[PDB]
Amino acid sequence: SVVQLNDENFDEVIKKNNKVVVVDFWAEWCGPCRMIAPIIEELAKEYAGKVVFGKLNVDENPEIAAKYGIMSIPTLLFFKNGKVVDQLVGAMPKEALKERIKKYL
């Protein structure tokens, strides 16, 4: 259950109480982003209920990428209680994303 993010729900999703929230900044044309898309879907199932995964398309929501100073995609930002706690820049394997999630559980 990955959530599609935009101006309407971004703040609602990242402020979810007692969740780790992972936001994937991506675009349709971005090869490395496509590579990690299925990894994110798999982890969203494994951690359903504990971790929320949101997708932020930077072509559609450039203001949001700007706000968080996203200089490169793919970038995954991790939030806890509405604040950025970590980030993973680049196209990493499942284990790297999994360990970064577990750090915040």
GROMACS .gro file of C-alpha atoms in nm:
model
  105
    1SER     CA    1   0.000   0.000   0.000
    2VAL     CA    2   0.216   0.282  -0.129
    3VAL     CA    3   0.043   0.623  -0.107
    4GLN     CA    4   0.048   0.873  -0.395
    5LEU     CA    5   0.150   1.212  -0.250
    6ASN     CA    6   0.071   1.567  -0.354
    7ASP     CA    7   0.002   1.912  -0.208
    8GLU     CA    8  -0.326   1.791  -0.060
    9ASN     CA    9  -0.204   1.502   0.154
   10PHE     CA   10   0.175   1.547   0.193
   11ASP     CA   11   0.165   1.700   0.542
   12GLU     CA   12  -0.104   1.453   0.657
   13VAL     CA   13   0.109   1.154   0.553
   14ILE     CA   14   0.443   1.278   0.697
   15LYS     CA   15   0.291   1.373   1.035
   16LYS     CA   16   0.129   1.033   1.102
   17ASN     CA   17   0.171   0.962   1.472
   18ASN     CA   18   0.410   0.680   1.570
   19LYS     CA   19   0.487   0.581   1.209
   20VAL     CA   20   0.813   0.589   1.023
   21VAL     CA   21   0.727   0.760   0.695
   22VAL     CA   22   0.944   0.705   0.385
   23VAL     CA   23   0.892   0.942   0.091
   24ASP     CA   24   1.027   0.837  -0.252
   25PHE     CA   25   1.105   1.133  -0.478
   26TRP     CA   26   1.077   0.995  -0.828
   27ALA     CA   27   0.985   1.054  -1.193
   28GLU     CA   28   0.863   0.832  -1.478
   29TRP     CA   29   1.177   0.885  -1.689
   30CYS     CA   30   1.424   0.815  -1.409
   31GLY     CA   31   1.587   0.476  -1.458
   32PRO     CA   32   1.728   0.434  -1.109
   33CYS     CA   33   1.387   0.533  -0.967
   34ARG     CA   34   1.223   0.254  -1.170
   35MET     CA   35   1.477   0.008  -1.034
   36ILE     CA   36   1.380   0.074  -0.670
   37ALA     CA   37   1.003   0.097  -0.725
   38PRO     CA   38   0.944  -0.279  -0.678
   39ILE     CA   39   1.172  -0.288  -0.373
   40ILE     CA   40   0.960  -0.018  -0.215
   41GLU     CA   41   0.637  -0.211  -0.297
   42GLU     CA   42   0.778  -0.525  -0.131
   43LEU     CA   43   0.887  -0.343   0.185
   44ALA     CA   44   0.550  -0.160   0.200
   45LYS     CA   45   0.390  -0.503   0.236
   46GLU     CA   46   0.646  -0.639   0.486
   47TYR     CA   47   0.610  -0.333   0.708
   48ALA     CA   48   0.240  -0.252   0.654
   49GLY     CA   49   0.105  -0.090   0.969
   50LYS     CA   50   0.448   0.015   1.098
   51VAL     CA   51   0.590   0.210   0.811
   52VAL     CA   52   0.413   0.429   0.555
   53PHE     CA   53   0.561   0.460   0.204
   54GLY     CA   54   0.466   0.763  -0.004
   55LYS     CA   55   0.555   0.849  -0.362
   56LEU     CA   56   0.627   1.211  -0.460
   57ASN     CA   57   0.655   1.267  -0.833
   58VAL     CA   58   0.891   1.559  -0.875
   59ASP     CA   59   0.756   1.656  -1.219
   60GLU     CA   60   0.405   1.692  -1.074
   61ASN     CA   61   0.506   1.842  -0.738
   62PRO     CA   62   0.830   2.041  -0.796
   63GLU     CA   63   0.751   2.285  -0.511
   64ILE     CA   64   0.761   1.995  -0.264
   65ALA     CA   65   1.096   1.866  -0.394
   66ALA     CA   66   1.228   2.224  -0.372
   67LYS     CA   67   1.102   2.266  -0.016
   68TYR     CA   68   1.295   1.961   0.102
   69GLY     CA   69   1.606   2.054  -0.097
   70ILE     CA   70   1.599   1.739  -0.312
   71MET     CA   71   1.905   1.798  -0.531
   72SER     CA   72   1.902   1.458  -0.699
   73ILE     CA   73   1.664   1.168  -0.762
   74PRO     CA   74   1.618   0.894  -0.661
   75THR     CA   75   1.611   1.022  -0.297
   76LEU     CA   76   1.418   0.859  -0.013
   77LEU     CA   77   1.350   1.086   0.287
   78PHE     CA   78   1.265   0.936   0.622
   79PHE     CA   79   1.032   1.116   0.862
   80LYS     CA   80   0.939   1.056   1.221
   81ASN     CA   81   0.673   1.274   1.380
   82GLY     CA   82   0.670   1.517   1.091
   83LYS     CA   83   1.047   1.578   1.081
   84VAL     CA   84   1.324   1.449   0.852
   85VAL     CA   85   1.542   1.199   1.036
   86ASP     CA   86   1.739   1.039   0.752
   87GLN     CA   87   1.776   1.004   0.378
   88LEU     CA   88   1.906   0.757   0.124
   89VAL     CA   89   2.035   0.913  -0.198
   90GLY     CA   90   2.071   0.693  -0.509
   91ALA     CA   91   1.952   0.346  -0.625
   92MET     CA   92   2.024   0.111  -0.332
   93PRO     CA   93   1.936  -0.255  -0.274
   94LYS     CA   94   1.653  -0.374  -0.050
   95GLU     CA   95   1.885  -0.438   0.249
   96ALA     CA   96   2.003  -0.078   0.259
   97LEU     CA   97   1.645   0.059   0.273
   98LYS     CA   98   1.541  -0.211   0.521
   99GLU     CA   99   1.819  -0.128   0.766
  100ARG     CA  100   1.749   0.245   0.747
  101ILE     CA  101   1.379   0.174   0.830
  102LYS     CA  102   1.473  -0.047   1.126
  103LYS     CA  103   1.692   0.226   1.266
  104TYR     CA  104   1.373   0.428   1.332
  105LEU     CA  105   1.129   0.162   1.451
   0.00000   0.00000   0.00000
